[PDB]
Design a protein around this nucleic acid. Structure first.
Ligand SMILES: [Mg+2]
Ligand SMILES: [Mg+2]
Ligand SMILES: [Mg+2]
Ligand SMILES: [Mg+2]
Ligand SMILES: [Mg+2]
Ligand SMILES: [Mg+2]
Ligand SMILES: [Mg+2]
Length: 39
RNA sequence: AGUCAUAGGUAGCAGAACGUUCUGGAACAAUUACGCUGAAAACAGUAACAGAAUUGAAGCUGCUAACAUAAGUAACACUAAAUGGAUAACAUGGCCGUAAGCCCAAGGUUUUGCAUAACAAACAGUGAAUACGGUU
């Protein structure tokens, strides 16, 4: 029984501010990656 | 949504994303999937939002496992020698004979016996009685 307005806040709707968190750079992950061969 | 401008790249720097495993948000595969294609790529075709990582492998004379190549190749030449339709009991021939014979020791520890395939190791076998060796 799908229902529920879009303004209800729950643990599956949360998101941080844009620019607050970044992905870690995993070095050693291929030539196309950001720090691929020598780190 | 129409005009312009830019777009070779190693070292390096910056930005955006794909995928794997697990968790939170009640439960996103009980009864499967299978029109064979889509996308710029990583890929997709059984959620999505966040998070935690032992998170991505042709490339370390790396490690493990499997499978090829060389290749049906090399090898099956230290010796006495075999033959009769059998690794024969029989016959013929040959070889050792201070050994390739016989009796023990050390060591081995059942390697020892039985079936013209077989269903047999699951079964047997080592006897101190000559003042045998040891034990003293
Ligand atoms: Mg460029
Ligand atoms: Mg140019
Ligand atoms: Mg859950
Ligand atoms: Mg690792
Ligand atoms: Mg041959
Ligand atoms: Mg014969
Ligand atoms: Mg003995």
């Amino acid at each position: 029984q799908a229902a529920g307005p879009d303004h209800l806040v729950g643990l599956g709707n949360l998101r941080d501010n844009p620019g607050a968190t970044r992905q870690r750079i995993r070095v050693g992950r291929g030539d196309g990656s950001r720090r691929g061969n020598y780190g």
